[PDB]
Design a protein around this ligand. Sequence first.
Ligand SMILES: *[C@@H]1O[C@H](CO)[C@@H](O[C@@H]2O[C@H](CO)[C@@H](O[C@@H]3O[C@H](CO)[C@@H](O)[C@H](O[C@@H]4O[C@H](CO)[C@@H](O)[C@H](O)[C@@H]4O)[C@@H]3O)[C@H](O)[C@H]2NC(C)=O)[C@H](O)[C@H]1NC(C)=O
Ligand SMILES: *[C@@H]1O[C@H](CO)[C@@H](O[C@@H]2O[C@H](CO)[C@@H](O[C@@H]3O[C@H](CO)[C@@H](O)[C@H](O[C@H]4O[C@H](CO)[C@@H](O)[C@H](O)[C@@H]4O)[C@@H]3O)[C@H](O)[C@H]2NC(C)=O)[C@H](O)[C@H]1NC(C)=O
Ligand SMILES: *[C@@H]1O[C@H](CO)[C@@H](O[C@@H]2O[C@H](CO)[C@@H](O[C@H]3O[C@H](CO)[C@@H](O)[C@H](O)[C@@H]3O)[C@H](O)[C@H]2NC(C)=O)[C@H](O)[C@H]1NC(C)=O
Ligand SMILES: *[C@@H]1O[C@H](CO)[C@@H](O[C@H]2O[C@H](CO)[C@@H](O[C@H]3O[C@H](CO)[C@@H](O)[C@H](O)[C@@H]3O)[C@H](O)[C@H]2NC(C)=O)[C@H](O)[C@H]1NC(C)=O
Ligand SMILES: *[C@@H]1O[C@H](CO)[C@@H](O[C@@H]2O[C@H](CO)[C@@H](O)[C@H](O)[C@H]2NC(C)=O)[C@H](O)[C@H]1NC(C)=O
Ligand SMILES: *[C@@H]1O[C@H](CO)[C@@H](O[C@@H]2O[C@H](CO)[C@@H](O)[C@H](O)[C@H]2NC(C)=O)[C@H](O)[C@H]1NC(C)=O
Ligand SMILES: *[C@@H]1O[C@H](CO)[C@@H](O[C@@H]2O[C@H](CO)[C@@H](O)[C@H](O)[C@H]2NC(C)=O)[C@H](O)[C@H]1NC(C)=O
Ligand SMILES: *[C@@]1(*)O[C@H](CO)[C@@H](O[C@@H]2O[C@H](CO)[C@@H](O)[C@H](O)[C@H]2NC(C)=O)[C@H](O)[C@H]1NC(C)=O
Ligand code: NAG
Ligand code: NAG
Ligand code: NAG
Ligand code: NAG
Ligand code: NAG
Ligand code: NAG
Ligand code: NAG
Ligand code: NAG
Ligand code: NAG
Ligand code: NAG
Ligand code: NAG
Ligand code: NAG
Ligand code: NAG
Ligand code: NAG
Ligand code: NAG
Lengths: 128, 124, 124, 124, 441, 110
Amino acid sequence: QVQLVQSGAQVKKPGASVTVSCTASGYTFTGYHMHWVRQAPGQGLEWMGWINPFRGAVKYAQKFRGRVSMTRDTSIEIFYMELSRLRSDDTAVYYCAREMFDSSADWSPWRGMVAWGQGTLVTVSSAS
Amino acid sequence: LGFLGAAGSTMGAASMTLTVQARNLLSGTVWGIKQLQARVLAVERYLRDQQLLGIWGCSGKLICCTNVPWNSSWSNRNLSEIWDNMTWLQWDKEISNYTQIIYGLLEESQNQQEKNEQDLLALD
Amino acid sequence: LGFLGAAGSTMGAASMTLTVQARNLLSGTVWGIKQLQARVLAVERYLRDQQLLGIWGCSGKLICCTNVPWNSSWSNRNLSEIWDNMTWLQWDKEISNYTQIIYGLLEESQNQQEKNEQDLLALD
Amino acid sequence: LGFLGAAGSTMGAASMTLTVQARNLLSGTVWGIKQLQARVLAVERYLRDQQLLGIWGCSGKLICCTNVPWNSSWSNRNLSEIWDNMTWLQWDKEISNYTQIIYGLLEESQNQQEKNEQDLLALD
Amino acid sequence: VTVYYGVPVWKDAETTLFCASDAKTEKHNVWATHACVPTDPNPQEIHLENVTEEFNMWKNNMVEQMHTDIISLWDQSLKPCVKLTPLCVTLQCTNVTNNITDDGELKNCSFNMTTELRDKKQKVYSLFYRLDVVQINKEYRLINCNTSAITQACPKVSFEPIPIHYCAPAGFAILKCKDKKFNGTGPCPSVSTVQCTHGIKPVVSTQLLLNGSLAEEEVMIRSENITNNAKNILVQFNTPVQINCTRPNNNTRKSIRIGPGQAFYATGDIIGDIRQAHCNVSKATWNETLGKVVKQLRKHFGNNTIIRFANSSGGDLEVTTHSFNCGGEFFYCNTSGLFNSTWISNNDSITLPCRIKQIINMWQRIGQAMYAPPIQGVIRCVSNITGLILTRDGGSTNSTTETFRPGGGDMRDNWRSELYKYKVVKIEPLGVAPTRCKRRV
Amino acid sequence: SALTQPASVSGSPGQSITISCTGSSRDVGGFDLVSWYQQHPGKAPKLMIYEVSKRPSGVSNRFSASKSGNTASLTISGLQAEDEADYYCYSYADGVAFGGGTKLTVLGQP
Ligand SMILES: *[C@@H]1O[C@H](CO)[C@@H](O[C@@H]2O[C@H](CO)[C@@H](O[C@@H]3O[C@H](CO)[C@@H](O)[C@H](O[C@@H]4O[C@H](CO)[C@@H](O)[C@H](O)[C@@H]4O)[C@@H]3O)[C@H](O)[C@H]2NC(C)=O)[C@H](O)[C@H]1NC(C)=O
Ligand SMILES: *[C@@H]1O[C@H](CO)[C@@H](O[C@@H]2O[C@H](CO)[C@@H](O[C@@H]3O[C@H](CO)[C@@H](O)[C@H](O[C@H]4O[C@H](CO)[C@@H](O)[C@H](O)[C@@H]4O)[C@@H]3O)[C@H](O)[C@H]2NC(C)=O)[C@H](O)[C@H]1NC(C)=O
Ligand SMILES: *[C@@H]1O[C@H](CO)[C@@H](O[C@@H]2O[C@H](CO)[C@@H](O[C@H]3O[C@H](CO)[C@@H](O)[C@H](O)[C@@H]3O)[C@H](O)[C@H]2NC(C)=O)[C@H](O)[C@H]1NC(C)=O
Ligand SMILES: *[C@@H]1O[C@H](CO)[C@@H](O[C@H]2O[C@H](CO)[C@@H](O[C@H]3O[C@H](CO)[C@@H](O)[C@H](O)[C@@H]3O)[C@H](O)[C@H]2NC(C)=O)[C@H](O)[C@H]1NC(C)=O
Ligand SMILES: *[C@@H]1O[C@H](CO)[C@@H](O[C@@H]2O[C@H](CO)[C@@H](O)[C@H](O)[C@H]2NC(C)=O)[C@H](O)[C@H]1NC(C)=O
Ligand SMILES: *[C@@H]1O[C@H](CO)[C@@H](O[C@@H]2O[C@H](CO)[C@@H](O)[C@H](O)[C@H]2NC(C)=O)[C@H](O)[C@H]1NC(C)=O
Ligand SMILES: *[C@@H]1O[C@H](CO)[C@@H](O[C@@H]2O[C@H](CO)[C@@H](O)[C@H](O)[C@H]2NC(C)=O)[C@H](O)[C@H]1NC(C)=O
Ligand SMILES: *[C@@]1(*)O[C@H](CO)[C@@H](O[C@@H]2O[C@H](CO)[C@@H](O)[C@H](O)[C@H]2NC(C)=O)[C@H](O)[C@H]1NC(C)=O
Ligand SMILES: *[C@@H]1O[C@H](CO)[C@@H](O)[C@H](O)[C@H]1NC(C)=O
Ligand SMILES: *[C@@H]1O[C@H](CO)[C@@H](O)[C@H](O)[C@H]1NC(C)=O
Ligand SMILES: *[C@@H]1O[C@H](CO)[C@@H](O)[C@H](O)[C@H]1NC(C)=O
Ligand SMILES: *[C@@H]1O[C@H](CO)[C@@H](O)[C@H](O)[C@H]1NC(C)=O
Ligand SMILES: *[C@@H]1O[C@H](CO)[C@@H](O)[C@H](O)[C@H]1NC(C)=O
Ligand SMILES: *[C@@H]1O[C@H](CO)[C@@H](O)[C@H](O)[C@H]1NC(C)=O
Ligand SMILES: *[C@@H]1O[C@H](CO)[C@@H](O)[C@H](O)[C@H]1NC(C)=O
Ligand SMILES: *[C@@H]1O[C@H](CO)[C@@H](O)[C@H](O)[C@H]1NC(C)=O
Ligand SMILES: *[C@@H]1O[C@H](CO)[C@@H](O)[C@H](O)[C@H]1NC(C)=O
Ligand SMILES: *[C@@H]1O[C@H](CO)[C@@H](O)[C@H](O)[C@H]1NC(C)=O
Ligand SMILES: *[C@@H]1O[C@H](CO)[C@@H](O)[C@H](O)[C@H]1NC(C)=O
Ligand SMILES: *[C@@H]1O[C@H](CO)[C@@H](O)[C@H](O)[C@H]1NC(C)=O
Ligand SMILES: *[C@@H]1O[C@H](CO)[C@@H](O)[C@H](O)[C@H]1NC(C)=O
Ligand SMILES: *[C@@H]1O[C@H](CO)[C@@H](O)[C@H](O)[C@H]1NC(C)=O
Ligand SMILES: *[C@@H]1O[C@H](CO)[C@@H](O)[C@H](O)[C@H]1NC(C)=O
């Protein structure tokens, strides 16, 4: 089976840093790329980055470079998505999307990312 | 011209270079087992080639003759435009369409037909 | 009729299936080491058989004759009651006691002779 | 006289014992991998010898005439002074320097000429 | 019809390729060549004309064979050496450095270790590196103590990349694309055959192809497809770049006993000043090499666009930095200064921090780790840089600027840099032909 | 978003409609990696189709999609109740980009 269990919802203050976990199960961990997708409630769909589990190669988005930081731990088979310098617009639910084909495919890291996680909603509000 | 020396030369000039690559077809613990399996594969493929040649109505090396006509569907051209205007690579690229049944009929209608009446007209 | 296919066929028709088993004779870590051992054994047996065909005065397939005499010891019987009364199975079962000496005779008495007078007559 | 029996015998007599050693050129974990390696070496060497014997234009055994002139320089002797004076051992010892050029020249100049005009004379 | 035996026919195929090495120094079965057969003394390289072959270095199956072969050879040469399962033990470890930032990066750990006699136990000390141990809750322990089994590379063998020739067996020939302007895919005007390849140094490196082949007098930017950012961009230089890689620390090797018959080589006191390795590259020569490579890069993206170089994005230490070996141990140079230039339209040496890491889990096989032994004395080596494993960052709606960052990780790119101009084809000397001849009856 | 999408499409079940994911000459006509997504309200998006003129497994044949040059199109057949969700067009051009979103109504009011 394929299940991408994430962490629970978190409440943050603007200017802080937020990290979220997304564990993978039931497939070869070091052969499938993992897209991280962020969704603010009610608007369009955007993208964090994709991690190659083999050697941890990453590639971020132009508008998130300098803020996002993604790592992983192969031994425990989980994914990490750390976002810092939070802004009021960053209040959203984050999705981790496992890809469909193996990393050695022709267009593997740009495929449809069939498998998706449950999603963690982070609330970044000036209210305390 | 060495191994595969006349690879691009015309067939008429390539008719005399059969020898070099007929000769060089034999070349005389892990990381050492590769040598063993490679040489076994080499000898087995050499025997494929020799057995295919022998079972055909040739039993002769680098050249033979036969009694089967030319099917009128296999690249119907003239002698000049096949023997002087073309090289083996392009030809066997445009001829791999029936090579299987080319060999099938070249063995059936020769070994079990021509060699059949060989057996008969020597048995008569 | 496939490999060993016309085994039960009488030699009148079994003489025409020889090319089938000639073509399929060599059939074109542990649990994988057996593959290598089996393939090298197949190669060795095939080349032993080809060598026996070679040291004999045949140098060909499916047929060869010779000048060495036949022995009554070898299933003394007339042509009809050995080519139409039995197959190769029973006959071999009754002649698989002379195979070494029959091979030796039909080898030395002509290869050590008939090729020698052939060279001598070409030497004139 | 058995495998390598008449080694010291005169070449005229040695011509009659070629087949007894041509017959025995195939002879049918660690400390057992040696058997596999040895049999692979033996079979590959025998196939190298057969490839040489066939590419030279005879494909026959124990006797192979040709159409390439043997210049007197290499021999520097006469028919009696070669076939009687010395056996094959010291003959090879005194000739084991040209065998490369001997083989290459008698193979090329024989095949790629005689076989080519043989196809030509059958082309008419 | 008429069949010919020995017809000049080759077809694309895959087969097991054996090796051949120079006879020139056994050094107790050097990692690269132990049972490798002697190379051909005279490498007959045969040239061809009227020859056109569809080369494809990315669909080439030779590189996969060499990668698996290197994996198996490393495991085989690493198997009989000393197991380091008793090093998993609580390390009472303390800082060494008095002045602030005189050098972490040097940890003096005192621990227990079972001696020759199982009844007795000995108290020993060693100088580990920060990247080699992690803190447990100060008490430290080996970083790969909970995920694999540490195995010391027995120091009798060396890590020298020896030139290796992979030579195809009988019936298989290796085609060499000898033309100058070779892209990586398509017909090759000058195809030449050879028994087997030149001397390949199986170096292990990322972001810089050390001691590679630089015969390409042009900086040919290669990749399986330019438009795909996520696929690494292969670069091969023409002018070598000199590099002075040094480990100024003078380490002494202490043979701590883990007998019976087992030795654990631990670092003794660093006799001399405590320093960190620095990987120097001449600023000028590196500048002009970058100028050449960017001039050639502009041929793949527009006519004139901004090309920006930046430090590695992120990932494992073996990817964010420059992994390699110098004289017997593995260490990394962040090369954050070699990629910081941004170019729009158009004497000293740059110095890079370099961090030692004895324990290594290269190739990311969790089933086995490794412990590189310390090397006595100062380690100094000079290598030549012939290529960059760059990766292109994602573009935008209007990509007037394109930023190139170092990549690597997957070692197959390292091997493709030496096997781009080679491929194996099997021979099919059987082939029919039309003739006027006629066999007799 | 680099991809422009229709706001919403309305109708009854049973007929056939098309969802035009028009884009630029460098995104839909430039490549051939255009895909379509299905996001239930409050549920993580699912892959409703593999790519242009390409259907994957786990989905019904009712989703037939292609690209008409500069205007990629998703045509859903056999309109039914379960289709009631939000559909996101997904193309491929360097850094990954996503469509704004295509709402749809079935067997209900516009
Ligand atoms: C690219 O190619 C470079 C040139 O070959 C190479 O750099 C040289 O590499 C050699 C081999 O590693 C270095 O020499 C050895 O170094 C080790 C470690 O110091 C020594 O143990 C070894 O033997 C000793 O040498 C001592 C004198 O140096 C001597 O007193 C001892 O008795 C003993 O013989 C060698 O000296 C050499 O120093 C490197 N640099 C130079 C100046 O040539 C690069 O490493 C290579 N790069 C890669 C990535 O492969
Ligand atoms: C084998 O041993 C290794 C080495 O000890 C071990 O590696 C560690 O695994 C743990 C997870 O099991 C990692 O822990 C995480 O690290 C990330 C780093 O960014 C943290 O973000 C994680 O969360 C903490 O930090 C956040 C910061 O914003 C906090 O918000 C959050 O509340 C947490 O405090 C978390 O700590 C750890 O980094 C690695 N590496 C090291 C050096 O410890 C590996 O897991 C072991 N394998 C097994 C199967 O035991
Ligand atoms: C890492 O810690 C080691 C243990 O503290 C240290 O080595 C030990 O240092 C002490 C001095 O601090 C030495 O003490 C002995 O020195 C001489 C030896 O003849 C005499 O004065 C006494 O015998 C005295 O006890 C230890 O001999 C020495 N080694 C051992 C085995 O304990 C290392 O130097 C430290 N390494 C670094 C680089 O900090
Ligand atoms: C390898 O990389 C190619 C691009 O270098 C891929 O291609 C596809 O995408 C390019 C644009 O990036 C298209 O290029 C132009 O083609 C013609 C003009 O020659 C026009 O359609 C238009 O100007 C395009 O921009 C390619 O046409 C397009 N190819 C296909 C088949 O759709 C290519 O797909 C990629 N992978 C492979 C397997 O080759
Ligand atoms: C090796 O094992 C011994 C087991 O006793 C450790 O000994 C103890 O060490 C602590 C400090 O770490 C002392 O407080 C105890 O009194 C010691 N016990 C005895 C009986 O000596 C020893 O420390 C271990 N080695 C190291 C380097 O810590
Ligand atoms: C690329 O450069 C950035 C700085 O622009 C590096 O990030 C800093 O690295 C130092 C040293 O490790 C840290 O002290 C800082 O806290 C880091 N800053 C941030 C914002 O993370 C980064 O490590 C460099 N990358 C590489 C691979 O060299
Ligand atoms: C590393 O340090 C050791 C210890 O100083 C050097 O070995 C010798 O040390 C003695 C005592 O200081 C000196 O008298 C010798 O001259 C040293 N050896 C030599 C050859 O000079 C060792 O040489 C040092 N290694 C390096 C490469 O600096
Ligand atoms: C290579 O990149 C590293 C960061 O990954 C640089 O590290 C510096 O580390 C010191 C602390 O030791 C910080 O004060 C600096 O700010 C760091 N610099 C950067 C750019 O992050 C390292 O200097 C880089 N090496 C170069 C530029 O050659
Ligand atoms: C190449 O073609 C020319 C055509 O005239 C021919 O003379 C030459 O022998 C050929 N040689 C090779 C190596 O193909
Ligand atoms: C040759 O083979 C082709 C195969 O299509 C067949 O049509 C033809 O009749 C055969 N014989 C001749 C004389 O062409
Ligand atoms: C003959 O068959 C081969 C193998 O299918 C093919 O590559 C070649 O193009 C064909 N030639 C034709 C159809 O003329
Ligand atoms: C069975 O044996 C008879 C014996 O006369 C023979 O004629 C016939 O062909 C054989 N049939 C087969 C299929 O072997
Ligand atoms: C044939 O050989 C046998 C011995 O194998 C011998 O008894 C017999 O006389 C020989 N000749 C004939 C005609 O049988
Ligand atoms: C060997 O001799 C026996 C004598 O009874 C005979 O039955 C047998 O068929 C002969 N050949 C063999 C064993 O194949
Ligand atoms: C040895 O030489 C002598 C010379 O007279 C000859 O009679 C004898 O038969 C030879 N022996 C062999 C085994 O050739
Ligand atoms: C015979 O003549 C040919 C051609 O000149 C030469 O290659 C060969 O070595 C000569 N060998 C002798 C002396 O038999
Ligand atoms: C082979 O011939 C060369 C040239 O005459 C000579 O130097 C060499 O000694 C010969 N080798 C022998 C007779 O074994
Ligand atoms: C001592 O070791 C700790 C380990 O975390 C390190 O943070 C610290 O900087 C080191 N030095 C001092 C002076 O505490
Ligand atoms: C082939 O060469 C051309 C330039 O002649 C280049 O544009 C193209 O990208 C190359 N193809 C590959 C994939 O190497
Ligand atoms: C590195 O050291 C060697 C040996 O002293 C020297 O030849 C080389 O020029 C140095 N590197 C540079 C870039 O100057
Ligand atoms: C490289 O050299 C040019 C002059 O040719 C200079 O403008 C530029 O700043 C240099 N770049 C670096 C990084 O030194
Ligand atoms: C690289 O260039 C940037 C340009 O802003 C500069 O800030 C940085 O210090 C440079 N790095 C090095 C090591 O020269
Ligand atoms: C390649 O590196 C070596 C040192 O490892 C150096 O001597 C050589 O000059 C460099 N490149 C070339 C071919 O000049």
